[PDB]
């Protein structure tokens, strides 16, 4: 009654029969902006079906020597579907997300992942190596899009913060002896109630193998990791022509 689930929203459902449990980030569901909070005076659009779908984005192969990946949300979906068309026309934006990452393996493979969220995941550099040149990260390390980006130094998460206490932020583990998926429901976290969808990326989805993959030779050596996400309770405002960046 906990191992088996089904998440239907929009026209797309996903079934899982070896889940762990759904955690709701910071204990509350995504919701619409109340009139106590809103400052924009134009009526928002709320598509309510066409953008609240599980978008399956990409597939990272996980071998025995991987480091970890990250996806900046919502810039994984400003190139995809009716979410990517409404977020490019409209200046303002708010939504929550239901984030579901699948990674199946046999009952002989082993290894654990820490799929975790963290809001305002800013990216530092190696500062020129020795630490004296103020190098800023490029635009693709900042906002990789639906392609994702691989961590260089996952012990410090490319930001000088340790991964050992990433477990404070909303997370759950995918260890291949127990579960194969990890649902994380995230509300809209930001100070101001709407923001731009092209500039500001509210959070980043860190997916790091902490305990590495291991399997005896003869088993299937290709163990993919696919993340599917669904913008919940999304609404846009401030209509103008299409910007792409």
């Amino acid at each position: 009654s906990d191992r088996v689930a089904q998440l239907t929203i929009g026209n797309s459902t996903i079934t899982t029969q070896e889940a762990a449990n759904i955690i709701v980030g910071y204990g509350e569901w995504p919701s619409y902006c109340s009139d106590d909070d809103a400052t924009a005076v134009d009526k928002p659009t709320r598509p309510d079906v066409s953008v609240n779908r599980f978008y399956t984005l990409d597939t990272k192969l996980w071998e025995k020597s991987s480091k970890g990946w990250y996806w900046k949300f919502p810039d994984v979906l400003t190139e995809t579907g009716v979410f990517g068309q409404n977020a490019q026309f409209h200046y303002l934006y708010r939504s929550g997300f239901c984030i579901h990452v699948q990674c199946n393996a046999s009952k002989f493979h082993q290894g654990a992942l820490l799929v975790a969220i963290l809001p305002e995941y800013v990216i530092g550099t190696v500062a020129g190596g020795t630490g004296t040149e103020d190098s800023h990260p490029p635009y693709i390390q900042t906002q990789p899009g639906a392609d994702g980006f691989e961590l260089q130094h996952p012990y410090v998460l490319d930001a000088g913060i340790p991964i050992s206490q990433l477990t404070v932020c909303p997370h759950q583990w995918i260890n291949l002896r127990t579960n194969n998926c990890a649902t994380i429901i995230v509300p809209y976290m930001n100070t101001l109630p709407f923001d731009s969808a092209l500039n500001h990326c509210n959070f980043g989805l860190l997916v790091v193998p902490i305990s590495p993959l291991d399997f005896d030779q003869g088993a299937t050596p290709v163990i993919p990791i696919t993340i599917t996400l669904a913008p919940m309770c999304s609404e846009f405002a401030g209509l103008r022509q299409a910007v792409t960046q």
Binding site: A5, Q6, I9, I185, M232
Partner: peptide, 12 residues
């Protein structure tokens, strides 16, 4: 409407 609910699964 949508449903985000463990335990019960109508698809499987």
């Amino acid at each position: 409407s949508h449903r985000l609910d463990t335990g019960e699964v109508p698809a499987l």
